[PDB]
UniProtKB/Swiss-Prot annotation:
Subunit structure, as described in the record: Homodimer. Interacts with RRAS. Interacts (phosphorylated form) with VAPA. Interacts with OSBPL6.
Tissue specificity annotation: Expressed in a subset of small lymphocytes (at protein level). Expressed at high concentration in kidney, lymph node and thymus. Expressed at moderate concentration in stomach, jejunum, ileum, appendix, spleen, leukocytes, trachea, lung and thyroid gland. Expressed at low concentration in whole brain, esophagus, duodenum, ileocecum, colon, skeletal muscle, bone marrow, placenta and mammary gland. Isoform 1a, isoform 1b, isoform 1c and isoform 1d are highly expressed in brain, bone marrow, colon, kidney, lung, skeletal muscle, spleen, thymus and thyroid. Not expressed in heart and liver.
Role played: Phosphoinositide-binding protein which associates with both cell and endoplasmic reticulum (ER) membranes. Can bind to the ER membrane protein VAPA and recruit VAPA to plasma membrane sites, thus linking these intracellular compartments. The ORP3-VAPA complex stimulates RRAS signaling which in turn attenuates integrin beta-1 (ITGB1) activation at the cell surface. With VAPA, may regulate ER morphology. Has a role in regulation of the actin cytoskeleton, cell polarity and cell adhesion. Binds to phosphoinositides with preference for PI(3,4)P2 and PI(3,4,5)P3.
Post-translational modification: Phosphorylation is enhanced in vitro by phorbol-12-myristate-13-acetate (PMA), forskolin and calcium ionophore A23187. Phosphorylation seems to be stimulated in conditions of low cell-cell (or cell-matrix) adhesion.
Location(s), subcellular: Endoplasmic reticulum membrane; Cytoplasm, Cytosol; Cell membrane; Cell projection, Filopodium tip
Domain comment quoted from the record: The FFAT 2 motif is required for interaction with VAPA and regulation of the endoplasmic reticulum targeting of ORP3. The FFAT 1 motif may contribute to VAPA binding. The PH domain binds phosphoinositides, with a preference for PI(3,4)P2 and PI(3,4,5)P3. The PH domain mediates targeting to the plasma membrane.
Name of the encoding gene: OSBPL3
Recorded family membership: Belongs to the OSBP family.
Official protein name in the record: Oxysterol-binding protein-related protein 3
Amino acid sequence: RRRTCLPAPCPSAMPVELNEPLNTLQRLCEELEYSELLDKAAQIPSPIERMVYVAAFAISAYASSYYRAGSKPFNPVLGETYERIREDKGFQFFSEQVSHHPPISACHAESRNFVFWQDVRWKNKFWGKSMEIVPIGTTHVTLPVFGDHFEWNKVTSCIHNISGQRWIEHYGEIVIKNLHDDSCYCKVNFIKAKYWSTNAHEIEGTVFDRSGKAVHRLFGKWHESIYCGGGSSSACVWRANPMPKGYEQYYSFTQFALELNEMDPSSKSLLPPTDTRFRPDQRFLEEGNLEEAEIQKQRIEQLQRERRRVLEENHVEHQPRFFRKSDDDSWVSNGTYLELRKDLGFSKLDHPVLW
């Protein structure tokens, strides 16, 4: 039912040839590739075993990045949105680029079993021949059935040898807490690789009780599989979905990623006009038309600049449509996107014209 190809193979201010045809909002949606971990967490009465699956969920967010070091996602323009209603996975995702200077992406997804949301700001920085990626923002998951509210941070990424001998790495510590239950917390270390070994991508984690005693260990590789151990017992709690055959020909997308930008002709009229699916530069890139992709990308950046200039001449601050700024200065859904969609009410908002 959903596509498993693009019209054209991937090519063998940034030139479009370096882009993949997804943007930052869509990469947020990719963090729900393994949302079945939350469905399973919502069925585990014990908060300590449940924390294991949330941790695996947090780790699973990194898997897809393994094959994608060669490509850069599009920067959404200010006011761009992206939705993703997945009956199959039982969630409704939507997102919005709420700031461009600096770039901030916000997202929110509802399921009968969980609510997932975050806002993220990425700081890039080139260091010699390599690029350091430093995210700011917190990820949240609630599991209503238990009153759980988990929160955790992202770690640092590095893209090395920025040649075809390039590779991405993640390292740092994730700390996961449940704000409604201090009975346990979790710390996960993404181990930085060593020059003497090919062995990389390793994860070492522990679920601690409130006193700091170790109850479960977590270990494995963030692009492969993760195991849980807990006194004489051990189990695989997660593994990566296999890449589709010939996946390299389409930006090395997972099957999930390949589905994200697809325009479904039956549900098209349900979308607000800021949805990424309408963005023409990404669509030309999918079609292998690099020249027109580049023209459209430059044009879209120009439109964004002119719009920003007008706003500051009129002393007007940009106002996101589906997210509001909390006291945290974090961005959260204002509870209107899915309600307006359902009610066919997108016309009732004044949408910036982005392309």
